[PDB]
Scaffold this active site. Sequence first.
Site, PDB file in Angstrom:
ATOM      1  N   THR A  17      78.942 113.871 -33.373  1.00 41.42           N
ATOM      2  CA  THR A  17      79.674 114.860 -32.322  1.00 41.42           C
ATOM      3  C   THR A  17      80.352 113.917 -31.211  1.00 41.42           C
ATOM      4  O   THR A  17      81.208 113.968 -30.710  1.00 41.42           O
ATOM      5  CB  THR A  17      78.742 115.683 -31.238  1.00 41.42           C
ATOM      6  OG1 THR A  17      77.384 114.982 -31.177  1.00 41.42           O
ATOM      7  CG2 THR A  17      78.254 116.817 -32.464  1.00 41.42           C
TER       8      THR A  17
ATOM      9  N   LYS B 208      75.246 105.565 -29.738  1.00 42.30           N
ATOM     10  CA  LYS B 208      74.498 106.716 -30.413  1.00 42.30           C
ATOM     11  C   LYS B 208      72.961 106.218 -30.724  1.00 42.30           C
ATOM     12  O   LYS B 208      72.806 104.819 -30.408  1.00 42.30           O
ATOM     13  CB  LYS B 208      75.057 106.730 -31.598  1.00 42.30           C
ATOM     14  CG  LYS B 208      75.155 105.724 -32.610  1.00 42.30           C
ATOM     15  CD  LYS B 208      76.510 105.423 -33.346  1.00 42.30           C
ATOM     16  CE  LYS B 208      76.872 106.447 -34.073  1.00 42.30           C
ATOM     17  NZ  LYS B 208      77.993 107.262 -33.809  1.00 42.30           N
ATOM     18  N   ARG B 209      72.325 106.792 -30.772  1.00 45.89           N
ATOM     19  CA  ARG B 209      70.796 106.376 -31.164  1.00 45.89           C
ATOM     20  C   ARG B 209      70.959 105.533 -31.939  1.00 45.89           C
ATOM     21  O   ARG B 209      71.657 105.162 -33.108  1.00 45.89           O
ATOM     22  CB  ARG B 209      69.858 107.528 -31.688  1.00 45.89           C
ATOM     23  CG  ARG B 209      69.561 108.494 -30.310  1.00 45.89           C
ATOM     24  CD  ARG B 209      68.738 107.975 -29.339  1.00 45.89           C
ATOM     25  NE  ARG B 209      67.294 107.435 -29.809  1.00 45.89           N
ATOM     26  CZ  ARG B 209      66.305 108.321 -29.778  1.00 45.89           C
ATOM     27  NH1 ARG B 209      66.164 109.195 -28.889  1.00 45.89           N
ATOM     28  NH2 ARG B 209      65.263 107.818 -30.155  1.00 45.89           N
TER      29      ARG B 209
ATOM     30  N   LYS C 279      84.112 113.246 -29.194  1.00 40.86           N
ATOM     31  CA  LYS C 279      84.146 113.069 -27.737  1.00 40.86           C
ATOM     32  C   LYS C 279      85.465 111.756 -27.607  1.00 40.86           C
ATOM     33  O   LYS C 279      86.093 112.009 -26.780  1.00 40.86           O
ATOM     34  CB  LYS C 279      82.931 112.870 -27.024  1.00 40.86           C
ATOM     35  CG  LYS C 279      81.797 113.769 -27.203  1.00 40.86           C
ATOM     36  CD  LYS C 279      80.230 113.164 -26.713  1.00 40.86           C
ATOM     37  CE  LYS C 279      79.366 114.071 -27.344  1.00 40.86           C
ATOM     38  NZ  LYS C 279      78.109 113.561 -26.970  1.00 40.86           N
TER      39      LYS C 279
ATOM     40  N   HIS D 125      70.254 119.930 -40.153  1.00 37.74           N
ATOM     41  CA  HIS D 125      71.214 119.005 -39.254  1.00 37.74           C
ATOM     42  C   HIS D 125      70.743 117.539 -40.171  1.00 37.74           C
ATOM     43  O   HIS D 125      71.270 116.618 -39.267  1.00 37.74           O
ATOM     44  CB  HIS D 125      70.561 118.691 -37.961  1.00 37.74           C
ATOM     45  CG  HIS D 125      70.870 120.039 -36.828  1.00 37.74           C
ATOM     46  ND1 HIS D 125      71.996 120.385 -36.097  1.00 37.74           N
ATOM     47  CD2 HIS D 125      70.039 120.976 -36.628  1.00 37.74           C
ATOM     48  CE1 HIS D 125      71.976 121.234 -35.469  1.00 37.74           C
ATOM     49  NE2 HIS D 125      70.503 121.830 -35.759  1.00 37.74           N
TER      50      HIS D 125
ATOM     51  N   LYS E 108      73.060 104.606 -39.506  1.00 35.78           N
ATOM     52  CA  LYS E 108      74.138 104.792 -38.357  1.00 35.78           C
ATOM     53  C   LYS E 108      74.716 103.396 -38.485  1.00 35.78           C
ATOM     54  O   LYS E 108      75.996 103.142 -38.056  1.00 35.78           O
ATOM     55  CB  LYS E 108      74.102 104.862 -36.884  1.00 35.78           C
ATOM     56  CG  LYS E 108      73.449 106.470 -36.662  1.00 35.78           C
ATOM     57  CD  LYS E 108      72.765 106.829 -35.438  1.00 35.78           C
ATOM     58  CE  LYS E 108      72.413 108.187 -35.243  1.00 35.78           C
ATOM     59  NZ  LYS E 108      73.610 109.216 -34.965  1.00 35.78           N
TER      60      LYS E 108
END
Lengths: 810, 810
Positions: A650, A542-543, A654, A351, A548
């Site tokens: 992911t 998101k975290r 969504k 991952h 990110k």
Amino acid sequence: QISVRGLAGVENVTELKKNFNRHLHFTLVKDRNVATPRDYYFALAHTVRDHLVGRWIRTQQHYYEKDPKRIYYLSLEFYMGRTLQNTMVNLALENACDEATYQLGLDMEELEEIEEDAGLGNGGLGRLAACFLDSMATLGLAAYGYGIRYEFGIFNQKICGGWQMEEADDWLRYGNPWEKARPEFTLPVHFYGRVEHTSQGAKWVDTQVVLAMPYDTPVPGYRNNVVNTMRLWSAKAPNDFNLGYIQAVLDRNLAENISRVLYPNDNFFEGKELRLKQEYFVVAATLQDIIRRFKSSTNFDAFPDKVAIQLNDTHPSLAIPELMRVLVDLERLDWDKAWEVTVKTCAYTNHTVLPEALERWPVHLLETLLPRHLQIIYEINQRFLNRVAAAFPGDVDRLRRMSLVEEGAVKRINMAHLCIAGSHAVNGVARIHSEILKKTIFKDFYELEPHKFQNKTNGITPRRWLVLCNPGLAEIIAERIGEEYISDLDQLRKLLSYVDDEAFIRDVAKVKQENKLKFAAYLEREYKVHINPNSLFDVQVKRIHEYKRQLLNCLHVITLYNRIKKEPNKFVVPRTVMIGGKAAPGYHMAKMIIKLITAIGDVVNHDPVVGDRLRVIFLENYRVSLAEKVIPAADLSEQISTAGTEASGTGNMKFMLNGALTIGTMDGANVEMAEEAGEENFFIFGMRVEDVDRLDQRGYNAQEYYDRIPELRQIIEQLSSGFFSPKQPDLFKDIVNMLMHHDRFKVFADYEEYVKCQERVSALYKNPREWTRMVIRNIATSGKFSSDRTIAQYAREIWGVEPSRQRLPA
Amino acid sequence: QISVRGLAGVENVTELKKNFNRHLHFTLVKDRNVATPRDYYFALAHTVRDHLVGRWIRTQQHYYEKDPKRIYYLSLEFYMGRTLQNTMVNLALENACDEATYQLGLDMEELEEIEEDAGLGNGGLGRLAACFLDSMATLGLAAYGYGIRYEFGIFNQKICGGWQMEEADDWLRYGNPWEKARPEFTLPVHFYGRVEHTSQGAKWVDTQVVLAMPYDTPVPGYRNNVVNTMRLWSAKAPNDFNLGYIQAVLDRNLAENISRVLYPNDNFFEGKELRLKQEYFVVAATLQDIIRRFKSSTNFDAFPDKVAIQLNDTHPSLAIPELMRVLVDLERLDWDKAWEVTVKTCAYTNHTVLPEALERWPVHLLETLLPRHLQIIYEINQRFLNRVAAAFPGDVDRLRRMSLVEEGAVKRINMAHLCIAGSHAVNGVARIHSEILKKTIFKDFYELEPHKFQNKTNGITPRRWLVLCNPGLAEIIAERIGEEYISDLDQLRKLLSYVDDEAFIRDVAKVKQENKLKFAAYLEREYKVHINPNSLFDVQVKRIHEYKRQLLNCLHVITLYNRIKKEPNKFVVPRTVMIGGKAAPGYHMAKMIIKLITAIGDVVNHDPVVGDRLRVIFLENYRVSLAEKVIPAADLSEQISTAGTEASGTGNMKFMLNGALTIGTMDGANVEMAEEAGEENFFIFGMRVEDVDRLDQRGYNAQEYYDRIPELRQIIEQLSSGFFSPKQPDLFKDIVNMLMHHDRFKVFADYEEYVKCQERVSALYKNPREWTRMVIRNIATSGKFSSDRTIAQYAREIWGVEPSRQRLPA
Ligand SMILES: Cc1cn([C@@H]2O[C@H](CO)[C@@H](O)[C@H](O)[C@H]2O)c(=O)[nH]c1=O
Ligand SMILES: Cc1cn([C@@H]2O[C@H](CO)[C@@H](O)[C@H](O)[C@H]2O)c(=O)[nH]c1=O
Ligand SMILES: Cc1cn([C@@H]2O[C@H](CO)[C@@H](O)[C@H](O)[C@H]2O)c(=O)[nH]c1=O
Ligand SMILES: Cc1cn([C@@H]2O[C@H](CO)[C@@H](O)[C@H](O)[C@H]2O)c(=O)[nH]c1=O
Ligand SMILES: *Cc1c(COP(=O)(O)O)cnc(C)c1O
Ligand SMILES: *Cc1c(COP(=O)(O)O)cnc(C)c1O
């Protein structure tokens, strides 16, 4: 109320009501005069649970009879969220329960908000396991999820003075109606000890024993009457443990601490002993359970034909040497035969490519805690390297690069290499990620065994992520094409013929507006914060992590603010910028980013000149239940990781399924999403993977961008001078320093194109009709991202089993 | 099957069966093909539990409506034992459940053996609380038992190599179907901190908080549809507790350790901090609950009219200063008014005169843990001593003797003095004990406030101790006088008119023989040990302690053995000597006594010449469930404590009610038992309290007895020479040394009369008819020892409430 929520039959509603009253009385031991909303939630939960039992028992009996190949999904995380609504949806009981509770004078939605999230995960990796369980049940696979029953899941996040505060997630406080303890199936797990070499075989002796007690939770498939099992182990000390007397009893906690709490790290490896114990604990108990079930169906040759073990990342990698230990030491198989069985049984899913996220355990830890496993790992490495040497004679550097044992300061075991060597299949989670694996970090392995490498693009379950969280959208869609798409998402492509349909365009836009109104109300209800429902909802949830790039989003927000202050009476599309996510407790930079976000809001949200044209809100305690609320209300989905860092993502899927447009880099699954919907219907910007590599070869110098971009320079000077921290002028010095001197993620390099792209987004939002038509094109092409498609591929290409959409007699 | 077990109606049996199958399916989630005996036990338990709920809810609603005075029984111990059969007995469901399970193809007795004992007590004191709860419910009193839900109760005792080994009593492992968690009523308890004196009143600040979560267990009265509550608190850490991150979560155990384990001491004070925390924990949570319930009925003047608090020994003595703290600091009442309310509310029961058993806490402990309470205690002492000084002017020694604060090495607080000062009633547990209290240890207090001192002779519940454990005897008795005696034990006196009845004499003897056969079989079943059912069953079961003198019993056993070896072919009444009981983990002498007993058996049980004429067995893991098996099978009850040491004793009453004759000293309740049955029907021997005092005044010299009694000398020489420990000659040197030089309990002083008395017992046993007639005279006069009589006295003479035998509508 709505179609997709099932029928509210006369008989069933009457039945539900009597069972509700029965549980309130006999189970909760209360009466309508002293019962609280929580009491009512539990009465409803037990009532719905009763409907699962019958199907649960026959499903398991069914597998025993037909004895199909079993799929075991091993994961240290299962981010399940709430279970009540999901169970009603999969059993087609939603409208009936809504009616029954209505007749009892209760609001079911209010009751659903009382259930605690089962937060047994950190983020994407844990949520993927949860979506997978749902899809495996919906596709009739004899699958079992195996993990750890953490007493405390991911911490609850509180924001104090703009800083993240952590508090224990005591999710079992009021009890868990969904689980069923199975103390009768308790198994022993060994730790420490030493290895004894006798006449026939080695023996692991003088070990400390910890018992593993299983708790089973039902996993219902979508209206097919299939109910699989998620088995989570809990640590228990033996009764002769440590057996002053009082101290000996109190010290039992030492052994039971193994299943006490989930490590809160996301994409970051922390080599702590307790974490290693958790990893072996889940693997040891699970394998004994698997072998026990296999024998109750001596012929281990058929083991791979009846068992498939999927490793969710390297966390459960010890399954490989543990399987070898059992087969060789206990079953007495010869090494070669044991290895053949192991490889054909195991498969590994990677991952990430981030170096700091890969598990590399110090040999001295394995040496003390699992001496026999260390020996088996060395033997595996020895035989593996002999194969490499035979295939690439004289290539000594390849030997050291591919070794499972890393030399240096302290020797470490590369768990990823262990997994590749002992698995018949290795997969990435998105096309671009799987390709990067073969070209970079796993290149040597790919050249030795090209056949092992595959891709399995991630997906999300359309049950929880559409029907459950966005019934309004699910309804208008069903009105046009029926309900079949819920278990065959590819059918959404039929909506393309409605892109010019005025009625549909209006309904899609109406649903979004209603979701936004409902969410805007929620923000004032539980958090007391006013927002304009007419503004564009720009969200990034998101975290928190540097890769990110929530920081890039921050730079844009400040840019928008500075532009308004420069030309106050100039029209700009109103926006509500929402950012949410938890930071790992020891991740300093991540905690500083949270503070920066709240700091920006403090200035922006109270500037008279800005008005309701711009709002910056930090969504506190982002978790599954909150995701189900904010995603259906979003207009713009921020997926802006540096190209090559987000394996798949992911959350992006969504948002696409729920009517939000996407602004993002060509990273992870974003690439395939844009490919499915068409690049013209996506807001792509920034460097591609190749561009990032060119910049690295040349050397990234942030100073260059600061010197050539005035607006960027202004922002950095505002941060350094204390504009966003009056009382603490140098508060954000660490952030400025990182951005300017050691930014591994090139935030400045994508700034210009990002701001430009955001302008195009605002331009489209000004044209409601065209914005909505583009949304329809996205929803209509999101079918590929259903985890049902993902699981069907795993089944046929890795596990060797055929998925089934056949109902079981209820 | 038998009358007293209720009716097995057609409807009820059918109903029970369907609910049994319902729970097996929905509750346990199993089917008849995979269900184990344990699964069946739980199905039955939940089925019986359902019958309690309705009555439980209406009983509590009833008290709310009528608002009677509430009785709160505070105890750190509740030795409950098993709950299944007791519940069936009190609900008149035994025969119906036996039939229903029979029809399902199951043996109910087998299922009952699966339930774990709720061993939340050490012995007599804890069992008394359990019997009291039963009687209070049977007498319709609005009573609540309050204690601690220990995760681990009294340790399970294993015998290894003749030595006691302890292992954790993980009684909640498989779940507890009887309890109902009530997390909604969780209350905070404070520890440490410091006192702040402000303008108006003192304040306890900077405290550490531990939450108290209640678990409710139903307590059914005998066939009157009354179901009271036993509320046990469990310790929980707050979620912001200690809030690296991982360590903070793991350290929650520190706070939760409070309710982790029961201290295993019996008649011995251990001043450990954890024990003090447990004592305050139960008191603090309980008082808040009491006050909350009182306000939900400002006028604390009526508090004593609606509340009665009974302190089971000094363990919950902190209730006195805690009540003062709440009334003064929180409610703002003036001291004098608060003190009046406290005294009228509290009552204290003393259970011993042994100095080492009295609680005397070091001031430095209270000072650190409960600073505000220490201040309140000093103030109480100051005002109390001013009263003493006014009543006995110039008597300075009396002032120091009566002070709550003891001076010396380290200052300590005498909790017994605190209890007397703050209670309106102080009682002993047997006439002789209560008299000793007034003449010795509490003499000064009695002279100051004679009205406070009372006696309340102990009792046992005839439900568990007759009907439940000895249905055969209960049956033949009911056949003659009906069933009314079960809730009015005095009616047993009617059996006196049957002492010459040949049919009855035969039935009584038959029941005993059957019980002995059943027990003899049990010994071989679970413990594999052969015994002769025709021999006299001589048993002494109770905690191991020097004052109980299991050692005197040992001397007799060895005497019997030596006599046989001296004249092998001489006839002697066959005996099976059984001794059982646990020793506190740190009580060395007690552990040596256990070893001595097994050592004697090792020699005696394998001597060919002895044959089956004498057997010495140590009953392993003596607990409530075992007591229910061995007591009905006993012929001779050993109650031989040194006169003046056993406050009352209750095991003695259980044996009397079940057909065993008693050999004992005039100590505790033995005196009243002999008085009720007639001394001619009791085997009394040894020194009376007055004789012990004479010996002490003169000085006890064991050497004198050793020099004048040849048989005694022989035994001591056998012990010293290693006759009972060949491999370890000096193994029992500590025992011989104590007996010869520092025996506080004068074992040698009662040896001669004891052996002589035992000869008279054997003489009577040789005449079956006369032995049985004497038994009938004992059973017939045991009525006074029903805890129903005891509780009725507490109700009328201390609590100020009238008992009721009125049924509630079911
Ligand atoms: C828990 C955690 C820590 N860290 C950092 O790891 C570095 C190397 O150990 C430290 O120097 C730095 O202080 C930490 O904040 C991350 O990057 N991500 C994380 O999730
Ligand atoms: C190593 C690692 C990966 N991931 C994520 O797993 C998701 C499901 O495959 C991906 O979509 C996402 O790109 C990854 O960053 C996590 O959440 N936690 C992790 O520790
Ligand atoms: C737990 C316990 C200890 N002791 C003794 O207390 C003495 C004084 O502290 C010690 O010297 C001696 O070693 C102990 O065995 C008892 O008598 N009864 C007991 O229940
Ligand atoms: C101080 C104390 C007394 N007792 C017993 O309480 C029983 C019930 O009142 C009496 O019959 C018995 O004589 C006492 O020794 C205990 O068991 N444990 C104790 O710590
Ligand atoms: C879907 C989900 C994630 C993963 O989101 P990404 O943006 O892919 O990282 C994380 N947390 C929650 C609560 C989620 O529902
Ligand atoms: C009744 C009982 C006791 C008390 O027995 P005594 O001989 O009075 O000390 C102790 N333990 C158990 C298990 C009991 O049932």
